[PDB]
Amino acid sequence: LFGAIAGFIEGGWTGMVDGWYGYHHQNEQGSGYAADQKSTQNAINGITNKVNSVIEKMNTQFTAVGKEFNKLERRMENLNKKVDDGFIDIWTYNAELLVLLENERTLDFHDSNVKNLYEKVKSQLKNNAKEIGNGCFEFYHKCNDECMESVKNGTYDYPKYSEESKLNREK
């Protein structure tokens, strides 16, 4: 676990409907909910390949399990029963454990993606913004929709607002 989901970020947003991970901004123009398309798309590709790897790795040949034996062949019937029960037990154990462990792999993957998004935004903003907990940043400068979109796609231009942020911070 990485501490983002059910961690320093408490709960999810029912408002964000276009993706798994994303931002919620609040400016003078208004607030919103935008999903991070790059991280969400990477997660979608990974989860799709995991599901496909689980499904398509099972290949079988045409077989018929059922067999019939007479009364004088009971060692036959018992051996057939043994092979059938053994295969069923092995497959049941394997399937249950595989699902159990892959659920933890998927949830950890989502937690890591959220934390990585948080760290990316933090490294972009540097000291131009303050961390106020809950995965939430407060800007020392004045941002419009261009600034918010710039933070979102990954082209923030810290030097543009460095001076104003310094003036507002040291006050």
């Epitope: 409907v17 919103g32 909910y33 935008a34 979608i44 799709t48 929709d145």
Partner: antibody
Framework: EEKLVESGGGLVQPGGSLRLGCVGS????????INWVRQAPGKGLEWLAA????????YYADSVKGRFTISRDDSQNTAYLQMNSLRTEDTARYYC????????????????????WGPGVEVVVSS | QTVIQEPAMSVSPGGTVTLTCAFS?????????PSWFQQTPGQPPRLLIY???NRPTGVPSRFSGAISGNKAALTITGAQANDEADYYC??????????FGGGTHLTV
Amino acid sequence: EEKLVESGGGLVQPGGSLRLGCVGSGFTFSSAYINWVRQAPGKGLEWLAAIRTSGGGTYYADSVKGRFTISRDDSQNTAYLQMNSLRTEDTARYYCAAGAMTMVVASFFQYYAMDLWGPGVEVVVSS
Amino acid sequence: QTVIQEPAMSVSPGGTVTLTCAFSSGSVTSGDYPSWFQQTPGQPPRLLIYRTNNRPTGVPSRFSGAISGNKAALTITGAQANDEADYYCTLYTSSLNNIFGGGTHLTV
């Protein structure tokens, strides 16, 4: 039966205004990004505007920035493109597209996939 | 800035085409997510390949897409004479900002 139907259009003198409307049925409209594209007679497609869900943002092509505005009402499954100060080259067939392809691993709609298109609405700007 | 395409192409039935799409700029990458569109006159455009490799459910397994060198490429193999339509390419320069191509008028 996913469907988008355009509304509005007609003849407007240069310098006028319009509000094209696109109404969607058969899918969760509020979860789909909405694009407005245009096609002039005998000319290629030209992407004009896009609006995201839950106030994510509005994206405009540089050709129509400032003149055209995009908006959406999720309680009526409607998307509005309001055009102000139309020039004479703005005459075209206007389409509303939506990203409305589903995936098996999520309930979202696929990114970078404008699959659901409307029939279009004619806009003629002449004297 | 601007997306360059081929003004017109022709192909015989049962033959493959290589409808290409590029920028009037540097190389085209898979991060631009090209998407192709087939439009017949009087009809809305149809999505054929998205994200340069992926086909919707309805699209026949005949239109393939790839990034050949520095230009996106759409290949049609069967050419069943219903492919006589205008083929457009869109390249994404942002999250939702996309530029459409001029159009390749394919005749079979």
